[PDB]
Write a protein that holds these residues in place. Sequence first.
Motif, short mmCIF file in Angstrom:
data_model
loop_
_atom_site.label_atom_id
_atom_site.label_comp_id
_atom_site.label_asym_id
_atom_site.label_seq_id
_atom_site.Cartn_x
_atom_site.Cartn_y
_atom_site.Cartn_z
N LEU A 141 0.68 -1.11 0.31
CA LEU A 141 -0.04 -0.07 -0.17
C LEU A 141 1.02 1.27 -0.04
N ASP A 142 1.94 1.27 0.96
CA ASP A 142 2.61 2.60 1.15
C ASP A 142 3.43 2.60 -0.27
N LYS A 143 3.78 1.43 -0.88
CA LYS A 143 4.54 1.53 -2.41
C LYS A 143 3.73 2.00 -3.14
N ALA A 144 2.29 1.70 -3.50
CA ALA A 144 1.50 2.11 -4.27
C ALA A 144 1.18 3.70 -4.07
N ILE A 145 1.35 4.22 -2.81
CA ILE A 145 0.63 5.35 -2.66
C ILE A 145 1.80 6.36 -2.75
N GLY A 146 2.94 6.21 -2.23
CA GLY A 146 4.21 6.92 -1.86
C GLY A 146 4.18 7.71 -0.60
N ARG A 147 3.70 7.15 0.40
CA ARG A 147 3.82 7.62 1.80
C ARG A 147 3.26 6.59 2.66
N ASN A 148 3.55 7.11 4.04
CA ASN A 148 3.27 6.06 4.95
C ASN A 148 1.64 6.18 5.24
N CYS A 149 1.11 5.09 5.07
CA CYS A 149 -0.37 5.03 5.03
C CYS A 149 -1.03 4.70 6.20
N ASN A 150 -0.09 3.72 6.70
CA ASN A 150 -0.43 2.99 8.00
C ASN A 150 -2.11 2.28 7.67
N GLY A 151 -2.11 1.59 6.69
CA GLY A 151 -3.41 0.87 6.31
C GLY A 151 -4.62 1.83 5.88
N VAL A 152 -4.66 3.32 5.65
CA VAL A 152 -5.64 3.96 5.48
C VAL A 152 -5.33 5.08 4.28
N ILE A 153 -6.23 5.46 3.52
CA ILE A 153 -5.97 6.48 2.38
C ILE A 153 -7.14 6.89 2.20
N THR A 154 -6.99 8.37 1.44
CA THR A 154 -8.13 9.25 1.27
C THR A 154 -8.78 8.97 0.07
N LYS A 155 -9.85 9.62 -0.07
CA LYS A 155 -10.81 9.19 -1.22
C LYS A 155 -10.20 9.77 -2.63
N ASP A 156 -9.48 10.70 -2.47
CA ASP A 156 -8.54 11.11 -3.52
C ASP A 156 -7.38 10.21 -3.96
N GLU A 157 -6.89 9.30 -2.82
CA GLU A 157 -5.90 8.32 -3.27
C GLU A 157 -6.69 7.40 -3.90
N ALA A 158 -7.74 6.89 -3.40
CA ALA A 158 -8.61 5.84 -3.90
C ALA A 158 -8.75 5.98 -5.48
#
Length: 164
Positions: free
Chosen positions: A46-63
Motif C-alpha cells: 500500500l505504501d509502495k502504491a501511494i508513496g507515503r506511509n499510510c498505516n493501512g488507510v487512504i483518502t478518497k482522493d488516493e482511492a
Amino acid sequence: MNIFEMLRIDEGLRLKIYKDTEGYYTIGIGHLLTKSPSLNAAKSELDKAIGRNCNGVITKDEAEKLFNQDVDAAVRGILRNAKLKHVYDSLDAVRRCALINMVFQMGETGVAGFTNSLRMLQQKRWDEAAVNLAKSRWYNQTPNRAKRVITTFRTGTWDAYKNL
C-alpha cells in the motif's frame, strides 16, 4: 452511465485495507494489494502504491487515483492482448464496458480463458454467450455481479445497473 460508475457500483469504496470476496487484501475501489496472507505484506504494498506511509488507510482522493490507473491498465491490457482486442473492437460501446469490468476483476489472463464465450460474443450471439458465461466459477462465486455483467452483454443496455 460509464465504466467508472459501473465499476464503482460493483466494487464499492473502502478507505481501509479490507479482504476480497476471495479473502485477499484490497483497498479503495477494488484495488488488490497482495494475495499473501500478511497484513504486513499488504501494508507494505500500500505504501509502495501511494508513496507515503499510510498505516493501512487512504483518502478518497488516493482511492480515485488508484482507480484511474487500474481502469487505464485494464483497457491497455485488452488492447495488447490479441484474443481480447479482437473481441473488443467488434463490440458496441456498452458491451465494451462489460468486457472491461471482467478484465478489471479477473485479469487479462483470466478473461482470455473464456475462449468459447469470447467466440460467441464475437459472433454476436448474445443469448448463447450469456448462457456460456454463467457456467463458470466466476458466476458461482459472485453471482449478483456476474449477472449484472452478463445482462449487459446480453442486452447491450445499462438496465442491470439502473436498479443499483
